[PDB]
Amino acid sequence: CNDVTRIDAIESLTEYGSKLKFKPKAKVIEVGCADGSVSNILFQHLPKDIELLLSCDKNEKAVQFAKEHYKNNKTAYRVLDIEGDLPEDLKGKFDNFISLMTFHWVPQQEKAFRNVYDLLAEDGECFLTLKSYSHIYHMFVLQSKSRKWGPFMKNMKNFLSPYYDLSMPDQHIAKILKNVGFKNIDVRSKQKMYTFKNLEKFRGLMIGVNPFKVPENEFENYIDDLMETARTLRIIDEENGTLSFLFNMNIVHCTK
Amino acid sequence: HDCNDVTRIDAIESLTEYGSKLKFKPKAKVIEVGCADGSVSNILFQHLPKDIELLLSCDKNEKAVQFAKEHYKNNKTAYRVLDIEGDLPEDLKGKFDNFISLMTFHWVPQQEKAFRNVYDLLAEDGECFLTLKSYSHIYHMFVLQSKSRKWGPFMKNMKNFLSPYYDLSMPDQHIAKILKNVGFKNIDVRSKQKMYTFKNLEKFRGLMIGVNPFKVPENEFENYIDDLMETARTLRIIDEENGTLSFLFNMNIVHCTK
Numbered sequence: 001c002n003d004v005t006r007i008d009a010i011e012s013l014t015e016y017g018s019k020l021k022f023k024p025k026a027k028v029i030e031v032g033c034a035d036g037s038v039s040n041i042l043f044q045h046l047p048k049d050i051e052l053l054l055s056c057d058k059n060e061k062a063v064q065f066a067k068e069h070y071k072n073n074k075t076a077y078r079v080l081d082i083e084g085d086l087p088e089d090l091k092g093k094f095d096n097f098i099s100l101m102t103f104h105w106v107p108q109q110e111k112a113f114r115n116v117y118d119l120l121a122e123d124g125e126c127f128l129t130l131k132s133y134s135h136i137y138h139m140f141v142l143q144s145k146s147r148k149w150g151p152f153m154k155n156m157k158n159f160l161s162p163y164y165d166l167s168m169p170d171q172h173i174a175k176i177l178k179n180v181g182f183k184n185i186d187v188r189s190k191q192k193m194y195t196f197k198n199l200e201k202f203r204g205l206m207i208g209v210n211p212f213k214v215p216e217n218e219f220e221n222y223i224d225d226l227m228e229t230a231r232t233l234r235i236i237d238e239e240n241g242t243l244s245f246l247f248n249m250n251i252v253h254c255t256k
Numbered sequence: 257h258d259c260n261d262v263t264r265i266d267a268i269e270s271l272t273e274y275g276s277k278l279k280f281k282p283k284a285k286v287i288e289v290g291c292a293d294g295s296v297s298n299i300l301f302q303h304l305p306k307d308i309e310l311l312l313s314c315d316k317n318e319k320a321v322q323f324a325k326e327h328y329k330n331n332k333t334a335y336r337v338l339d340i341e342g343d344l345p346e347d348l349k350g351k352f353d354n355f356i357s358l359m360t361f362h363w364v365p366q367q368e369k370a371f372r373n374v375y376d377l378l379a380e381d382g383e384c385f386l387t388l389k390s391y392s393h394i395y396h397m398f399v400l401q402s403k404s405r406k407w408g409p410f411m412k413n414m415k416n417f418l419s420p421y422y423d424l425s426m427p428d429q430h431i432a433k434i435l436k437n438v439g440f441k442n443i444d445v446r447s448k449q450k451m452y453t454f455k456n457l458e459k460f461r462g463l464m465i466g467v468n469p470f471k472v473p474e475n476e477f478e479n480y481i482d483d484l485m486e487t488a489r490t491l492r493i494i495d496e497e498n499g500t501l502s503f504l505f506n507m508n509i510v511h512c513t514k
Contacts, residue, residue, distance in 0.1 A: 011426070132449050133504050138491075145492050165502070167451035168269070189447045191390050191506045193425040232490060233396075234403050244423070246391055248449045248506065 001033040002205055004194050004247075005101040009038045011192075012100060012129050012251060013045040019253070021125050025051040026095040029119055031082050032102050034062040036070050042098060043072065054094070056080035082112045086119065094119050096127070101249075103130035104161040110176050117180045120256040126182065127253055132163035132189065134247035136209075139229040149222060153212050163250065173250055182254040189250055196243040199236070203227060257316070258466060259291040262452050262505075263359040267299050269450075270358065270387045270509055275303045277444075277511060278385055283309040284353040287377055289340050290360045292320035294328035300356065301330075312352075314338035340370045344377065352377045354385070359507075361388035362419035368434050375438045378514040384440070385511055390421035390447065392505035393493055394467075400487035407480060411470045427508055440512040447508050454501045457494070461485060 022028070028050055032038050034057030043053060053075045057063050066077035080090070082099075083106055097116050106112040116126050131137070137160050144153040163169035170187040177185045196202045206226055214222045230236050235245050271278075280286070286308055288296050292315040300311065311333045315321050324335040338348070340357070341364050355374050364370045374384050389395070395418050402411040421427030428445040435443045454460040464484055472480045488494045494501050 015429075142492055163449070165451060165504070167449070169449055171273075188428075189449055189506075191421070191425070191427050191447050193423060234400055246423075248447075 001035050001037040002208070005033075006037055006041065007194065008129060008192065008249065009041045009100045013042065016127065016251065016253065017045045020045075020096070020127055022047045022050060023095050023123075024049055027051045027093060027121075028053045028096040028098065029080075029090070029094040030055045031057075031080065031097075031099040033057065034059065034066045034077055036066075038100050039070075039075070042100065043075070046074075050074060052076060054078055054090075056082075058082075082106060082115055083108045084115075086115050091118050092121055094124060095121055096125050099128045099130075101129050101131070103128055104132075104163070107158045107162060109162050109173075110180065113176050113182075114180045117182065117256060122256060124256040125253075126177075126255070127251075129249055129251050130163070131161045132169040132248040132250055133165065134161070135230075135233055135235055135245040136206075136247065137161060137164050138233065139206075139226060140210075142229040142232055143222075143226050146225065149212075149214070149225060152214050152222075159211055163248075169248075169250055173252060177252065177254050182256060184253075184255040186253040187250055188253075189248060192247050192249060194245060194247070196245075197241070199227075199241055199243060202243050257360065257363045259293050259295060259359065260463060264295065264299075265452065266387060266450065266507065267358045271299060271303055274385065274509065274511060278303060278354075279383060280305050280308060281353050281381075282307050285310050285312070285351055285379070286354040286356065287312045287314065287348070287352040289314045289338065289355075289357040291315060292317065292324040292335055294324060296358075297328070297330060297333050308332055310334060312336060312348075314340075316340075340364060340373050341366045342373075344373055349376050350379050352382055353379055354383050356384075357386045359387055359389070361386050362390075362421070365416045365420060367420050367431075368438065371434050371438050371440075375440065375514060380514060382514045383511070384514075385509075387510070388421070388508050389419045390424070390427040390506040390508055391419070392422075393491055393503035394505065395419060395422050396491065397464075397484060397487040398470075400490060401480075401484050404483065407470075407472065407483060410472045410480075417469055421506075421508065427506070431508055431510060435510070435512050440514065442511075442513040444511040445508060447506055450505050450507060452503060452505070455499070457485075457499055457501060460501055 028046060030039055030042060034055060039055045055075055056078050058081050060079050063077045063079045097119055143149050144156050166172050170189045174185050174187045207223060230243055236243050290296055296313050297311060313333060313335050316339045318337050321335050321337050355377055401407050402414055424430055428447045432443045432445045465481060488501055493503050
């Protein structure tokens with residue numbers, strides 16, 4: 001999680017929270033960064049009556065830290081790989097699935113959504129947010145097209161949102177939900193803008209999210225060239241040291 | 257402002273998605289704002305019932321309205337000059353069951369005024385349906401051009417050229433707030449990400465010359481467009497070997513009632 005996903009979570013739960021149906025003593029599963037931040041925000045928006053909030057992560061370590069560190073009455077952590085195979089004891093057991101700003105990382109969209117379907121009890125409600133196009137993704141695309149860095153950046157496809165360069169990603173997503181068997185499918189796209197006051201904070205976030213391995217000597221030249229893509233896109237305000245970037249995102253709301 | 261293959265395909269996509277949500281009363285008076293270019297009626301008549309009384313098709317452009325008057329005659333279609341940003345003529349106020357505007361309103365800086373004019377055109381329970389751009393790679397190209405030391409000086413009035421929603425977070429929520437204040441009901445504003453590919457960069461260049469409002473010295477005009485085309489290369493949206501240009505644009509779909 002980072003400050004962008006925190007603000008996005010608050011805006012999406014603010015906008016939609018009152019339209020999310022929770023049955024009495026709902027069992028709720030969350031897939032995000034097991035890290036507390038976004039899960040703590042989501043918790044504040046859930047009914048005080050909910051049976052359980054199972055908060056799941058792919059990283060065994062992150063889950064193990066969560067069990068030993070984070071402490072709330074209604075919250076359990078479990079290792080779950082939304083792209084993988086569902087363990088049998090989670091199948092059909094949840095009234096609400098929630099994933100805020102995670103699914104743009106999942107290249108196997110249909111597999112992940114069929115697992116959302118299979119985790120849900122009957123009349124189970126699905127609420128997901130994900131990126132499509134973004135200026136951050138676009139920075140990385142510009143970098144990938146350099147004579148110097150292109151060689152180390154051949155698997156761009158799985159780093160980018162599956163919806164990065166599609167027309168009507170909302171209709172692509174609606175089609176998969178339809179095929180997997182959801183009803184009352186609502187997919188809304190949003191243009192969002194976010195402004196950093198701190199270019200050094202922004203620089204750390206790129207370092208964090210960057211998956212492309214380069215020699216640890218050439219690493220700092222790699223990052224500097226990546227920051228220069230933001231200047232190429234003219235999204236840096238040098239006079240005030242701010243970066244204003246656009247991202248599109250998709251809010252999925254549907255029922256089993 | 258002139259309709260083209262991008263707006264042609266956005267009209268089809270928008271009307272096919274919303275053709276079921278869009279309602280037309282018997283003998284509907286419909287007003288349409290965009291191009292006097294007759295392709296308006298040819299797409300609308302795929303969704304308009306045979307019953308309608310009138311399609312009034314307006315443009316700010318007298319010359320376009322003259323041409324349509326002379327050449328394109330359906331019994332039920334009439335054409336008229338109208339600036340949606342300006343003051344409504346009294347004979348059009350409260351006369352319309354449907355207001356339709358595709359890919360025009362991003363050219364309107366005075367959004368609230370234009371939306372009040374839409375509201376004042378509509379009879380009671382009238383419906384409106386509009387589409388407009390927010391952010392696009394085309395706008396961004398012009399933004400890149402405006403930052404150059406050379407072309408910057410001729411391009412200080414960008415705000416009126418950019419969509420009012422070019423740089424806003426959640427343009428859908430801004431639009432829906434304006435509509436609520438003016439007094440619309442059943443407000444539905446949906447944003448979409450769209451992509452379009454040109455297979456002909458000479459066609460594309462010609463569209464840019466068409467849409468450029470910025471006045472440079474006449475003997476630097478070719479250098480100006482050359483650098484504009486170059487911003488497409490800078491964004492890396494030109495496929496050099498195939499001779500194609502794939503650009504992203506966000507748009508907004510407005511559906512609401514009076």
